[PDB]
Design a protein around this ligand. Structure first.
Ligand SMILES: Nc1ccn(C2O[C@H](COP(=O)(O)OP(=O)(O)OP(=O)(O)O)[C@@H](O)[C@H]2O)c(=O)n1
Ligand SMILES: [Mn+2]
Ligand SMILES: [Mn+2]
Ligand SMILES: [Zn+2]
Ligand SMILES: [Zn+2]
Lengths: 64, 188, 145, 133, 114, 146, 83, 263, 36, 764
């Protein structure tokens, strides 16, 4: 719905990286995997966390 | 209500095999990779060869690349995607290329004699779980005992059981009976 | 076909034989044709077996069909269950297939005698059926010290 | 309390078939036209090469727990390199007018053809086996 | 639900103890202790050290079902030597070597930049 | 010179085509368009998945909050599959997924995953893996024809 | 219609079924505080008690076997061989 | 300083790679485990919701709250709530935090964990503070609102161990390996054509001398060196995951001693 | 008739909403009443 | 009523006969227990705990019949139990209960278990009762039933209990055996090269709950104490068990580590896999049940599991995409293999297309053509797969599963790795549904492979679109054929069980229906129970005439053909003896006639048939039991043997009537066992083979006789049901040539159908 706070599998906080992940892509033009490695998310478990989140809240907040 | 997964709930990949959760382990106790990655989920190899679900196994190999490389992994049918190529790329990503990894026994730290096929794979929670499903009907004020359950118990020889479980609670009434005319005609 | 048969020195050997096999069945008449072995002709129609060679031969052909079904899937059932079944189907001498109030009125006018060895009978009546652990009675042993 | 056969072998052959750590030596006696060894060995704990050769003794001790070394820090009824402990299952293949007695070491198997030690080889398990290089 | 609360994995039920010690019938000089609200972390460590001890003839542990945090450790020892004594002896080294290590560590970290 | 790993295809023995397929992967329906590599599966299995996906939980619509239905199951944390098909796009499966990418081991490890069963990571659970909301609505009417 | 103790023709061995009935008939009674006939060398469990009874041969019941034609043979617990 | 030997090779606020040397696998592994499961830490474990007009359910957010890592360097000076003679919670067994947020702006308003106000008396033990490590000092995204949307909450933190729920755990992943060449043969390598072509060299191989192709297998060797690397989520600094780890072990084992004594 | 499936009957049923693709699937179903 | 139903899960830590019941389900179900001074203390504690704390109780009933509800009852905490009161107590560890997976198609789908009270919410089971319940853990649920009185408790545990159903009468072998993980691993554990070290060893030993505490001695002492996998499994296998077995070139030195041999409860040689530990005719679980009894056997599975899953937890086992790849060279050979078959079909084609193909006799041309190209294509498929199978290595985890028995077969390797193959719909190649073609991507009249359904590719490589669609045509056919199977099958099953339900065995040994009628004058033609019967070889039947006379003729009066005197003490002294000769010549005559008789009963020559009393096993045992030296003459004499065996014959009793009629039945019923007998305990055998002593010999025989009598069927058994369930149940696992076969056949049988589908005469 919203970034999850930690990697399901390792504990790494990952909830504090979504803003940035998305600024890394749209503002500084990185491909999704150099981006993720910039955030330090270098095991595949945390990668998948960022890489597959879907921000559904964004669509929830359009309702009044 | 929020439904936290448990023992009993069901799960499945997209290749037409389900499972229920049989037990949970916390992370310490799982087997781990040298990089300290551990599984969210451990499924048995016996489920494989006879189902001939090679899609599973390629989905997991292409998924591992895709997570390591940040690209969407093209699993469509009828393309030129190949294990060979998938494994190529994974090897460039410093893993052995068929998706094995050495893992360590959590209880002990020791290494494991054989290596493990390890990778992400998209699993679904399915509806319909051991809280909906558990009942237990023993009065105070399926789930039966049909003809086929009778017949098993006649096969075992269990007549007393077959009488108690089939009786009425409808009280044994008593009656006198003529021994020439068997009827209930008897003035007592 | 190969046919295990003892050899002159005694041990069993294969000896091929030709065999004919047919679509359609006329046992009483094919049995009669010159040059065949009439002692050993068969057919998967047990009915006809029964009608040419009788109840017993029918019962043995029937077994053999039921066992064939069961072993062609590759499984194994001990003899005596299918021997049971087949006896059941042939004990009146012919091959008999295995596959409320109204009824009681009939009983009444026929003077039906119900032996009361079944389970449901016995449930109606509040008793144990004379099966298994019900197939004897137990009594207090006045004869002991 | 004893020892009971003991002789020197010539190794004709070392097959590892299919295994890695284990191999089957086809050895001869230097001495006897008649007495042969087929036997299984842990090659990693005791490697062995074609034509190498072998000092081999079955023995019968030096049935209670087992206890680690300590007794073993002096008490060695071994001055060998290699010692197994097995069980005879024999078949007295009593063949021609020579013997063969069978032995299994946890499944690593042995077999001695010959004749002079009929009134020698334990009917029975308790049977150790020893090798030096 | 029918889930036992998590705390039960580390904290003692009314009536239970940290250890129960029981004499083994099978063989001499042998005990089986059962440790509650403990698991492999302790179980494999005490175990492993009882076996650097040469008057230790047997040691072993197991958790018999994973639903419960309890393990059962069986020490057998040379005549003269209490097993309980062997477990102090080995608990004792453990605490010793760690002692150590926290010290070799606390040191190696100051030698350090970042 | 062919790629020893590619599948064999047997050529155009054809000069008279009148048409060409747009894509073979269009022979499928909605469900089987979600299985990855269904050309690497025994046929019946693609058939069971096409059913069980109908029981998985995801986000049925972005409006759930505001509907009120008999029953509904929304997973906390939908992820899009690491392996997708091109057909998904049109089915919006990436947008309103029904699944999560679990790190999976295939292994005998203890014997508690025997006979189409699984061991799951309780820590992972702790931190939400597979959790979901469930809603039940109950109704009632009032008075009637009294 | 009764068959004399000699001439009896059915097995001298106890059947599973007879034994299951016996032990349970007896344990129903020992569970209703009926007197017992053996040494309680610790037992509290009525089946169990009954099965020590059946081994020490002190269960005084009789099994009445009907044959399919209405005729019967009476065999005592004491007597039946328990294999 | 004789015994089990250390050897840091990197360190960072966040990680600490090192090599233990002269120690049994077990103690190695046990340290491992303890780091993962048992080192005390601080985390929201109660939340009372006064108001939530958010697009997320209460339990949903509550959960997320228990997951935001909270300062924990003074956590020995905090009693476990269940040992404290308070009724429920108080300042010796709890921090209390507050959360309020209203979607004031047209555009969407984020709630982050720096928007977390403590409310209770710390006695100057450094605990409870949301931990912040992003450039922008947001820490973790908890929620989001639209203009008109409100959420009000209190939380209670409590000290806790990850056995009990992983929120409470300090360490993140923990690398761990030994014998990178394979020399013990503790693992047997699968392959198609050749076992070395096909498996990657661990980085941990340089530190260690290749074996030599004659050299007949070494039956005596043991597992004496291990390559780890502990990663901290931040509630507790790192060096501290290890020392506190060591230390929780050592108390484990002493509770065993004390209870031989009381037999 | 919309309410019942009264026509040929099961002709109309309640739309599945378990998951987005179960919905799409339902809208896409077909049914044959009643030689291969 | 008094029952529950949940989701089941597997659990390697429960015994065979346990059932884990969640505590909340244990708190709902109740058993009424009567206050007695044996329990009045426990009952009282239970009462004080109440409904909601387990061990507890929900009601107390007094004298009066007044029902005291402990949840409500203002006096629930103040009850002073009287003797003769009853207490409805929750169920608790060790109470019997009956557990059942529907549909219940034979009686071991309803077995009695021992309660174990556990946390969370599924019923839990040992992996090895799985197969009889035909249950697994992706969902299945099961029922559990709680018996309500003491009688009823005793029925359930003395006849329905798990342990008693190890060996079943359905097929005269076990119905439970080692599976899945512990199988995979018991093989890996027992290989040549598997050694364990002392740390691991002792942890394995402790894991067996009744290990005597003795560390056994290592098979390697020398560089290292290293024990083998063999020996540690061997700890679990109890004393007094002997088993041998020769696979296709096994010897007593098994090069390959084939077969098996096990003596005094230790493995000597052979890898343990499904033949030994699975639910196999003559394997260890069938042996131990019989030699030592149900309860030990049912401990064994849980010791074996204990051990091996320990070991497997530390060793590890997986499979991966790799295990399906075969070698680049192998795939070039696969690809040609396949290429060659397509050329053979091409020439057949042209050949038919020039009209030079012949039919043979009544079979059409086209049929002839099809029958040929489908042989060709399948012979391809197969050769391509054997190719793959060979190429893959011992470490191939798919191969390791097939090897062990635990999962997978050839066809699996084949389709995954080399080629999936011809697809077909009603027995034929994909048919021309469009006009003259199978799909519009082909031209008309195309009878080639690809056009009508061969799938060249493997699953690894993936299928093409065309291929894809024809495999799903194929697939589909199964999915329908399997619902029709399952439903046809369930109805037969219920009609055979209603047909037969009343037949019972009576204390005359007769089998009869509910009117008395006779169906069988003795059950099964032999009066045995089919649990007690095993496949033995009857020796007289086989063999040359020379070799039967070597083996059995004793001629005391000939110095070539007597018994050597090292055979026997009396052996000097009997040479030349005329009157021993006259007995021995009567023994022989009997062996001779035995050989004629049998060869008339089994005209074929098959030797191996199920009979009660495994005599080889008994002799094996007396050989272990009396430390037998093969190297000294025996003290048996001629007559001890020869009359000794005659006499045993008379006491092998199934029927016991004084008159002549029953006696002939008696004798006819025991005929075939008797021939085995005599063959097995003939003079020369007893001496020269077996070497028995006198003592051992007389042990043999009083063993044979108790074993014989304990095989006889018991009166009261409901053999009717039985019969029907045994024929039924397997008819359900027919989920799968040019005669009507499988279920519709069997429908055509039991129906007595005037108008059969394939009727056929076979004429010799
Ligand atoms: N030893 C084996 C090998 C395979 N299977 C099977 O795998 C196939 C498909 O799996 P699945 O649908 O999961 O079978 P079940 O679990 O029995 O399905 P369900 O419980 O939903 O009825 C079935 O044909 C079934 O035979 C099995 O039960 N036991
Ligand atoms: Mn299944
Ligand atoms: Mn199932
Ligand atoms: Zn991670
Ligand atoms: Zn407080």
């Amino acid at each position: 719905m919203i970034v999850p706070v930690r990697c399901f599998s390792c504990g790494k906080v990952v909830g504090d990286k979504w803003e940035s992940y998305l600024n890394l892509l749209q503002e500084d033009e990185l491909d999704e995997g150099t981006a993720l490695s910039r955030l330090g998310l270098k095991r595949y478990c945390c990668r998948r966390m960022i890489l597959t989140h879907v921000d559904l809240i964004e669509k929830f907040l359009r309702y009044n | 209500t929020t439904k936290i997964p448990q023992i009993g709930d069901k799960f499945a990949s997209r290749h037409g095999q389900k499972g229920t959760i049989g037990i949970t382990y916390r992370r310490e106790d799982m087997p781990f990779t040298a990089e300290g990655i551990v599984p969210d989920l451990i499924i048995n190899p016996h489920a494989i060869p006879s189902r001939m679900t090679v899609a599973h196994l390629i989905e997991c190999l292409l998924s591992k690349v895709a997570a390591l490389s940040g690209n969407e992994g093209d699993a469509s049918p009828f393309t030129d995607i190949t294990v060979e190529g998938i494994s190529k790329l994974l090897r460039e990503h410093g893993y052995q290329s068929r998706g094995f990894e050495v893992m360590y026994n959590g209880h002990t730290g020791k290494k494991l004699m054989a290596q493990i096929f390890f990778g992400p794979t998209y699993y679904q929670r399915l509806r319909h779980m051991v809280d909906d499903k558990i009942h237990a009907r023993a009065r105070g004020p399926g789930l039966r005992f049909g003809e086929m359950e009778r017949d098993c118990m006649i096969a075992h020889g269990a007549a007393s059981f077959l009488k108690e479980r089939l009786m009425e609670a409808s009280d044994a009434f008593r009656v006198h009976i003529c021994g020439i005319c068997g009827l209930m005609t008897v003035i007592a | 076909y190969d046919r295990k048969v003892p050899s002159p020195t005694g041990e069993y050997v294969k000896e091929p034989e030709w065999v004919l096999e047919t679509d359609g069945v006329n046992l009483s008449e094919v049995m009669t044709v010159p040059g065949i072995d009439p002692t050993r002709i068969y057919t998967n129609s047990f009915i006809d077996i029964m009608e040419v060679l009788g109840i017993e031969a029918g019962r043995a052909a029937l077994y053999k069909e039921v066992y064939n079904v069961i072993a062609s899937d590759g499984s194994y059932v001990n003899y005596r269950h299918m021997a049971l079944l087949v006896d059941v189907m042939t004990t009146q001498g012919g091959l008999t297939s295995v596959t409320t109030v109204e009824i009681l009125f009939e009983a009444g006018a026929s003077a039906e005698l119900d032996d009361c060895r079944g389970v449901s009978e016995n449930v109606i009546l509040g008793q144990m059926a004379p099966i298994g652990t019900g197939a004897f009675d137990v009594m207090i042993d006045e004869e002991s010290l | 309390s004893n020892t009971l056969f003991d002789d020197i072998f010539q190794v004709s052959e070392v097959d590892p078939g299919r295994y890695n750590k284990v191999c089957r030596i086809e050895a001869a006696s230097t001495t006897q036209d008649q007495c042969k060894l087929t036997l299984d060995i842990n090659v990693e704990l005791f490697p062995v090469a074609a034509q190498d050769s072998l000092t081999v003794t079955i023995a019968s001790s030096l049935t209670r727990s087992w206890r680690p070394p300590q007794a073993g820090d002096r008490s060695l009824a071994d001055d060998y390199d290699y010692v197994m402990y097995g069980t005879a299952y024999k078949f007295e293949e009593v063949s021609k007018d020579l013997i063969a007695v069978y032995y299994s070491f946890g499944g690593l198997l042995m077999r001695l053809e010959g004749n002079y030690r009929n009134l020698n080889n334990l009917k029975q398990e308790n049977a150790y086996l020893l090798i030096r290089r | 639900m029918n889930a036992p609360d998590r705390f039960e994995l580390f904290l003692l039920g009314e009536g239970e103890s940290k250890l129960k010690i029981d004499p083994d019938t099978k063989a001499p000089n042998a005990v089986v202790i059962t440790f509650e609200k403990e698991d492999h972390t302790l179980g494999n460590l005490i175990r492993a050290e009882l076996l650097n001890d040469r008057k230790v003839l047997f040691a072993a542990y197991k958790v018999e079902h994973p639903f419960f945090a309890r393990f059962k450790l069986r020490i057998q020892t040379t005549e003269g030597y209490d097993p309980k004594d062997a477990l102090k002896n080995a608990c004792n080294s453990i605490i010793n070597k760690l002692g150590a290590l926290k010290t070799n560590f606390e040191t190696e970290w100051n030698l350090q930049t970042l | 010179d062919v790629d020893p790993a590619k599948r064999i295809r047997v050529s155009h023995h054809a000069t008279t085509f009148t048409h060409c397929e747009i894509h073979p992967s269009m022979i499928l329906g909605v469900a089987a368009s979600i299985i990855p590599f269904p050309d690497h599966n025994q046929s019946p299995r693609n058939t069971y998945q096409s059913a069980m996906g109908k029981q998985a939980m995801g986000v049925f619509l972005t409006n759930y909050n505001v509907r009120m239905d008999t029953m509904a199951n929304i997973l906390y944390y939908p992820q899009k599959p690491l392996g997708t098909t091109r057909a998904m796009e049109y089915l919006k499966f990436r947008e309103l997924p029904a699944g999560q990418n679990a790190i999976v081991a295939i292994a005998c490890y203890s014997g508690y995953n025997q006979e189409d069963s699984m061991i799951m990571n309780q820590s992972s659970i702790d931190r939400g893996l597979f959790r979901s909301l469930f809603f039940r609505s109950y109704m009632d009417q009032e008075k009637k024809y009294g | 219609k009764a068959i004399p103790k000699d001439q009896r023709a059915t097995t001298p061995y106890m059947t599973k079924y007879e034994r299951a009935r016996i032990l349970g008939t007896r344990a129903l009674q020992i569970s209703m505080n009926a007197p017992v006939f053996v040494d309680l060398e610790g037992e509290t469990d009525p089946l169990r008690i009954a099965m020590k009874e059946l081994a020490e041969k002190k269960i005084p019941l009789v099994i009445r076997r009907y044959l399919p034609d209405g005729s019967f043979e009476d065999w005592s617990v004491e007597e039946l061989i328990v294999d | 300083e004789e015994g089990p030997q250390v050897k840091i090779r990197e360190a960072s606020k966040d990680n600490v790679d090192f090599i233990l040397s002269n120690v049994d696998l077990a103690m190695a592994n046990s340290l491992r485990r303890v780091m993962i499961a048992e080192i005390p830490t601080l985390a929201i474990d109660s939340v009372e919701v006064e108001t939530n007009t958010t697009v997320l359910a209460d339990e949903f957010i509550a959960h997320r709250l228990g997951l935001i890592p909270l300062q924990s360097m003074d956590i020995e000076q905090l009693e476990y709530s269940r040992d404290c003679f308070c009724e429920d919670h108080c300042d010796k067994c709890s921090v209390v935090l507050t959360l309020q947020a209203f979607g004031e702006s047209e555009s969407t308003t984020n709630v982050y964990s720096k928007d977390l106000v403590i409310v209770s008396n710390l006695m100057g033990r450094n605990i409870g503070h949301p931990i912040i490590q992003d450039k922008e000092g947001n820490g973790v995204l908890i929620c989001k609102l639209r203009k008109g949307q409100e959420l009000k909450l209190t939380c209670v933190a409590k000290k806790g161990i990850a056995k009990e729920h992983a929120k409470w755990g300090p360490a993140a992943a923990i690398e761990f390996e030994y014998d990178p060449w394979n020399k013990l043969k503790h693992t047997d390598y699968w392959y198609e054509q050749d076992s070395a072509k096909e498996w990657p060299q661990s980085k941990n191989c340089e530190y260690e001398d290749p074996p030599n192709e004659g050299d007949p297998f070494d039956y005596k060797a043991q597992a004496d060196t291990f390559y780890m690397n502990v990663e901290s989520v931040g509630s507790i600094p790192v060096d501290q995951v290890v020392v506190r780890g060591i230390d929780t072990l050592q108390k484990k084992v002493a509770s065993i001693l004390l209870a031989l004594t009381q037999m | 008739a919309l309410a019942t499936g009264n026509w040929g009957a099961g002709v109309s049923q309640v739309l599945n909403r378990y998951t987005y693709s179960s919905t799409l699937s339902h809208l896409r179903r077909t049914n044959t009443p009643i030689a291969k | 009523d008094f029952s529950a139903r949940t989701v089941i899960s597997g659990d390697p830590n429960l015994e065979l006969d346990q059932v884990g019941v969640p505590k909340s389900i244990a708190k709902t179900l109740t058993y009424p227990e009567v206050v007695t001074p044996y329990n009045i203390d426990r009952l009282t504690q239970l009462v004080r705990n109440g409904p909601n704390e387990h061990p507890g109780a929900k009601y107390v009933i007094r004298d009066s019949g007044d029902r005291i509800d402990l949840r409500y009852s203002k006096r629930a905490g103040d009850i002073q139990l009287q003797y003769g009161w009853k207490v409805e107590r929750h169920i608790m560890d060790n109470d019997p209960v009956l557990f059942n997976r529907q549909p219940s198609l034979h009686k071991m789908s309803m077995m009695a278990h021992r309660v174990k009270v556990i946390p969370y919410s599924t019923f839990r089971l040992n992996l090895s009762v799985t197969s009889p319940y035909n249950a697994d853990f992706d969902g299945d649920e099961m029922n559990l039933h709680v018996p309500q009185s003491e009688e009823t408790r005793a029925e359930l545990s003395q006849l329905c209990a798990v342990p008693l159903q190890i060996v079943s009468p359905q097929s005269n072998k076990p119905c439970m055996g080692i599976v899945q993980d512990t199988l995979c691993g018991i093989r890996k554990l027992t290989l040549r090269d598997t050694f364990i070290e002392l740390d691991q060893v002792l942890n394995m030993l402790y894991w067996v709950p009744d290990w005597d505490g003795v560390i056994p001695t290592p098979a390697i002492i020398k560089p290292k104490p290293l024990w083998s996998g063999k020996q540690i499994l061997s700890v679990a296998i109890p004393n007094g068990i002997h088993l041998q077995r020769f696979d296709e070139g096994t010897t007593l030195l098994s090069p390959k580590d084939n077969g098996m041999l096990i003596i005094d409860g230790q493995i000597i040689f052979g890898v343990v896999e499904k033949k030994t530990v699975g639910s196999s005719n003559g394997g260890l679980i069938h042996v131990v049940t019989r030699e030592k009894g149900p309860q030990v056997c049912a401990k064994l599975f849980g010791n074996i599991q204990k051990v091996v899953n320990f070991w497997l937890l530390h060793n590890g086992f997986s499979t991966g995409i790799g295990d399906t790849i075969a070698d680049g060279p192998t795939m070039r050979e696969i690809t040609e293999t396949i290429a060659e078959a397509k050329k053979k079909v091409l020439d057949v084609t042209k050949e038919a297309q020039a009209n030079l193909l012949t039919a043979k006799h009544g079979m059409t041309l086209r049929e002839s053509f099809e029958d040929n190209v489908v042989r060709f294509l399948n012979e391809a498929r197969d050769k391509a797969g054997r190719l793959a199978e060979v190429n893959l290595k011992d470490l191939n985890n798919v191969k390791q599963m097939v090897m062990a028995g635990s999962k997978g077969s050839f066809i699996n390797i084949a389709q995954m790795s080399a080629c999936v193959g011809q697809q077909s719909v009603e027995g034929k190649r994909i048919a021309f549904g469009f006009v003259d073609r199978t799909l519009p991507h082909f031209s008309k009249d195309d009878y080639s492979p690809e056009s009508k359904g061969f799938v060249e590719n493997s699953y690894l490589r993936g299928l093409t679109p065309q291929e894809f669609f024809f495999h799903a045509m194929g697939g589909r056919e199964g999915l329908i054929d399997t619902a029709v199977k399952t439903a046809e099958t369930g109805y037969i099953q219920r009609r055979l069980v209603k047909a037969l339900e009343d037949i019972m065995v009576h204390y005359d040994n007769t089998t009869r229906n509910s009117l008395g009628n006779v169906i069988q004058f003795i059950y099964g033609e032999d009066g045995m129970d089919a649990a007690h019967i095993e496949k033995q070889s009857l020796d007289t039947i086989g063999g040359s005439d020379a070799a039967f006379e070597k083996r059995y003729r004793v001629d005391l009066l000939n110095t070539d053909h007597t018994l050597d005197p090292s055979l026997l003490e009396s052996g000097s002294e009997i040479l030349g003896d005329l009157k021993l000769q006259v007995l021995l010549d009567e023994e022989y005559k009997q062996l001779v006639k035995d050989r004629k008789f049998l060869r008339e009963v089994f005209v074929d020559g098959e030797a191996n048939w199920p009979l009660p009393v495994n005599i080889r096993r008994i002799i094996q045992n007396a050989q272990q039991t009396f430390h037998i030296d093969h190297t000294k003459p025996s003290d048996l004499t001629i007559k001890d043997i020869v009359l000794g065996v005659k006499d045993l014959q008379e006491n092998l009793l199934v029927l016991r009537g004084k008159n002549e009629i029953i006696q002939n039945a008696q004798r006819d019923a025991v005929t075939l066992f008797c021939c085995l007998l005599r063959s097995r305990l003939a003079t020369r055998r007893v001496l020269q083979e077996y070497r028995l002593t006198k003592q051992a010999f007389d042990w043999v025989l009083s063993n044979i006789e108790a074993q014989f009598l304990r095989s006889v069927v018991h009166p009261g058994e409901m053999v009717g049901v039985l019969a029907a369930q045994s024929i039924g149940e397997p008819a359900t696992q027919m989920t799968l040539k040019k005669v009507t076969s499988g279920v519709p056949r069997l429908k055509e049988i039991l129906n007595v159908a005037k108008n059969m589908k394939t009727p056929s005469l076979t004429v010799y």
